[PDB]
Design a protein around this ligand. Structure first.
Ligand SMILES: *[C@@H]1O[C@H](CO)[C@@H](O)[C@H](O)[C@H]1NC(C)=O
Ligand SMILES: *[C@@H]1O[C@H](CO)[C@@H](O)[C@H](O)[C@H]1NC(C)=O
Ligand SMILES: *[C@@H]1O[C@H](CO)[C@@H](O)[C@H](O)[C@H]1NC(C)=O
Ligand SMILES: *[C@@H]1O[C@H](CO)[C@@H](O)[C@H](O)[C@H]1NC(C)=O
Ligand SMILES: *[C@@H]1O[C@H](CO)[C@@H](O)[C@H](O)[C@H]1NC(C)=O
Ligand SMILES: *[C@@H]1O[C@H](CO)[C@@H](O)[C@H](O)[C@H]1NC(C)=O
Ligand SMILES: *[C@@H]1O[C@H](CO)[C@@H](O)[C@H](O)[C@H]1NC(C)=O
Ligand SMILES: *[C@@H]1O[C@H](CO)[C@@H](O)[C@H](O)[C@H]1NC(C)=O
Ligand SMILES: *[C@@H]1O[C@H](CO)[C@@H](O)[C@H](O)[C@H]1NC(C)=O
Ligand SMILES: *[C@@H]1O[C@H](CO)[C@@H](O)[C@H](O)[C@H]1NC(C)=O
Ligand SMILES: *[C@@H]1O[C@H](CO)[C@@H](O)[C@H](O)[C@H]1NC(C)=O
Ligand SMILES: *[C@@H]1O[C@H](CO)[C@@H](O)[C@H](O)[C@H]1NC(C)=O
Lengths: 420, 84, 50, 198
């Protein structure tokens, strides 16, 4: 078939019509970013031939290719260590959550660590680690930071976020009740804090349900961690292709050098060895160039992850669609085998409603404009309401300012402003 | 160590903000001592549901960030290089 | 078939006709000795950067 | 070693170019690594064979250098794009992005040149000398709830004030610096205190 780009909806545009949401949903959404890849080292002289002196002697004369390949691979490995450092070593102090958990009804038990000794990692982190499922001169060097220490960085970032807000990312960690931090974040997105303080149980229930829902999706639904799996698969497939390429003639009598040495005279032996070595060098250089380009891709991903950790875990971002669909409220990091999983908590408006607007109010020959809201009417009476939530209020002098006469503004409506 | 074996370094129980990296969290410094690296100073914020901390002073801090912008414009004449 | 490596006891169960075993990437990992018919693993002796 | 990045890139380029020039002394299987000796020592056919081997070796060398340089140029172009973004959002204006223009509440930034790069001096505001206080989401006065317009309600033990969030500047809770929202039975944590009417 021919693909459909989506449902066709045409919004009811009018010159005096607005739709202001009367409710909201707290959506928790996941994003997965690769941070690092496996640290690999291939010693060139052992790979090309290995335990063959004649080969080593006549590979000495091809130059310093082996040294260049080795230094490129070592640079890649050090770069992965630095990628993990940049993403996770964002805080110089390991914060811990208080033993008593009174977060205003919010339940972080599903992303905080547990004393059940699962390598000291949260239950979402445990699902993420279970989902990703994984000699010839070729070695893998371990990462500098173990999984436990990435878990401890993640736990420190969570503890700081839930006990101090954005303050610990810009100076001294300053405690604040979590309900008040969430009210501050609501004011950030343009909703007055009374909305949180009056809907606190509802918001806490929605947040807890969202974390449980992402738990269920991660536990049951598959194909969620395909980015990390793709990185692992590409690396493993390249490495197996390299090793498999070692069983090729490249135009010679045999792929193995021992039979060539046993069964050929030293002139023709060195000719055939020359062609095996040239083939194996081409294979190794192809591998290293591909690995350098994949290293560039992973470096871009890790720099993006560092940016996201700085601007969404350690703060609240106004950059739309940078940390989830909706107005960003906060974000939580979780570790992954070779990456980071962000759980973005966002505010999605809901339960929209028909209203009639006006640019200004004419009272006493003066034009009044709202301070921080919008003029709405249910049909007979005029009110001032905030833009992102329907909280009607009587038009008064405290919430409206005068900016001239009434015969300059198009669409002014015709009303009284209460003076307290 | 998970990264191999160290000959010439004395293992210590102490955890320090380490200097020379080895692997698997072991990383040594100066006798040469090897240890599991400490992620940082452990502090617990005094969280409470009616407690805030407000700063009564400030510091104006100036930091430096170095960013590479350019590299040397190098041209190699292929035929002159390869043949001379 | 020639090689270099260290030989160890194995719990692998070759079929009676099978001589030597290979893993992925086509590398020899086990062999029967032709004398007393025992399965023995071949693993490369230690190498690694200093 | 505070300029290790620029020194690193210059060292990388110089090292790559040195290993390019040094490959010109490798015979790659030929009789000699110098062309003149092969020419003035072998007949034209075998000379051609040896010349061909040297040509293949040196094209591999040059192509390796060029591929490495292209990848390094991609790296440096990423660094230059980030530097342009920083000089836009840190120097030509104040940035709300966290850790983008330094540790702390960013105030401004100043560029400085370097031999092949830029040095940004980020001036930031780091709060210090913090004190504990007791808060409340709202104040219930005359049966109506009161929330700060901008700030936070704190107490030194016996009196309630409103302060801004990032600096301890107390003020008497008044109708000027507070707004009313509903009655005082829906907010959890509300406290009883007087709101001064001027
Ligand atoms: C809102 O909906 C009602 C009924 O669907 C409609 O009559 C009205 O015109 C809509 N609002 C505006 C401003 O047109
Ligand atoms: C808003 O939505 C929640 C659940 O999504 C519901 O319980 C509530 O009744 C709705 N209306 C208001 C005014 O909260
Ligand atoms: C959080 O949820 C878990 C199970 O999902 C439950 O055991 C725990 O009691 C909850 N915490 C609070 C404070 O309700
Ligand atoms: C509109 O708002 C006024 C003000 O509270 C209210 O009295 C009235 O019932 C509402 N609805 C209509 C249809 O006027
Ligand atoms: C909206 O448009 C209608 C007709 O198109 C017009 O009669 C009315 O005055 C307009 N209202 C405003 C506020 O411009
Ligand atoms: C609004 O009220 C003023 C009162 O002086 C009057 O001039 C104006 O005509 C009124 N607007 C309309 C549309 O009737
Ligand atoms: C390190 O701790 C172990 C116990 O885990 C103890 O036996 C040993 O003596 C300690 N060594 C030092 C140098 O403190
Ligand atoms: C703030 O700190 C500076 C030194 O950093 C000090 O001179 C000044 O007196 C302090 N301000 C107050 C109000 O104590
Ligand atoms: C004040 O806050 C600090 C945290 O910075 C805490 O250590 C101290 O116990 C608090 N004071 C009181 C009296 O609770
Ligand atoms: C709190 O501040 C008021 C302001 O005048 C002062 O009178 C009172 O003594 C202070 N309380 C304490 C415990 O310092
Ligand atoms: C703060 O938490 C304590 C639990 O120790 C509780 O007794 C108290 O009522 C809470 N205060 C507020 C304002 O929620
Ligand atoms: C606040 O004032 C009301 C009315 O005087 C009273 O019923 C309520 O108990 C007071 N709150 C507290 C915590 O005493």
């Amino acid at each position: 078939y021919t693909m459909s780009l989506g449902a066709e909806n045409s919004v009811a545009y009018s010159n005096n019509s607005i739709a202001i949401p009367t409710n909201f949903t707290i959506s928790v959404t996941t994003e997965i970013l690769p941070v690092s890849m496996t640290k690999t080292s291939v010693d060139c002289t052992m790979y090309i031939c290995g335990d063959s002196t004649e080969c080593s002697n006549l590979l000495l004369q091809y130059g310093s290719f082996c040294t260049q390949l080795n230094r490129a691979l070592t640079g890649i490995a050090v770069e992965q260590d630095k990628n993990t450092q940049e993403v996770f070593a964002q805080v110089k102090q390991i914060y811990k959550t208080p033993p008593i958990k009174d977060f205003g009804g919010f339940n972080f038990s599903q992303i905080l660590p547990d004393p059940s000794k699962p390598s000291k990692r949260s239950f979402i982190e445990d699902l993420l680690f279970n989902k990703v499922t994984l000699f010839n001169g070729l070695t893998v060097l371990p990462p500098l930071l173990t999984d436990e220490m990435i878990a401890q960085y993640t736990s420190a970032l969570l503890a700081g976020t839930i006990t101090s807000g954005w303050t610990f990312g810009a100076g001294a960690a300053l405690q604040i009740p979590f309900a008040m931090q969430m009210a501050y974040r609501f004011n950030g997105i343009g909703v007055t804090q009374n909305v949180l303080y009056e809907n606190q149980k509802l918001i806490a229930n929605q947040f807890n349900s969202a974390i449980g829902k992402i738990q269920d999706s991660l536990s049951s639904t598959a194909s969620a961690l395909g980015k990390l799996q793709d990185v692992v698969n590409q690396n493993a497939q390249a490495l197996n292709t390299l090793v498999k390429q070692l069983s090729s003639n490249f135009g010679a009598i045999s792929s193995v050098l021992n039979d060539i040495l046993s069964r050929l005279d030293p002139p023709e032996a060195e000719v055939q060895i020359d062609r095996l070595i040239t083939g194996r060098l081409q294979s190794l250089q192809t591998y290293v160039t591909q690995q350098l380009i994949r290293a560039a891709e992973i470096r871009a991903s890790a720099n993006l992850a560092a940016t996201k950790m700085s601007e969404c875990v350690l703060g609240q971002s106004k950059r739309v669609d940078f940390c989830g669909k909706g107005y960003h409220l906060m974000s939580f990091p979780q570790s992954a085998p070779h990456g980071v999983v962000f759980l973005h908590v966002t505010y999605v408006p809901a339960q929209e409603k028909n209203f009639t607007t006006a640019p200004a109010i004419c009272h006493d020959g003066k034009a009044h404009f709202p301070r921080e809201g919008v003029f709405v009417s249910n049909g007979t009476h005029w009110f001032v309401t905030q833009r992102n939530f329907y909280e009607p209020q009587i038009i008064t002098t405290d919430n409206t300012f005068v900016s001239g006469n009434c015969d300059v503004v198009i669409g002014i409506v015709n009303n009284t402003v209460y003076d307290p | 160590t998970r990264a191999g074996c160290l000959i010439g370094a004395e293992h210590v129980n102490n955890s320090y903000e380490c200097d020379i990296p080895i692997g698997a969290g072991i990383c040594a410094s100066y006798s040469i001592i090897a240890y599991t690296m400490s992620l940082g100073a452990e502090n617990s914020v005094a969280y409470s549901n009616n407690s805030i901390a407000i700063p009564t002073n400030f510091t104006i801090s100036v930091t430096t960030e170095i960013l590479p912008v350019s590299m040397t414009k190098t041209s190699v004449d292929c035929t002159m290089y390869i043949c001379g | 078939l020639t090689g270099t490596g260290v030989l160890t006891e194995s719990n692998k169960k070759f079929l009676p006709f099978q001589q030597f075993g290979r893993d992925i990437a086509d590398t020899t990992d086990a062999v029967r000795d032709p004398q007393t018919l025992e399965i023995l693993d071949i693993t490369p002796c230690s190498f690694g950067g200093v």
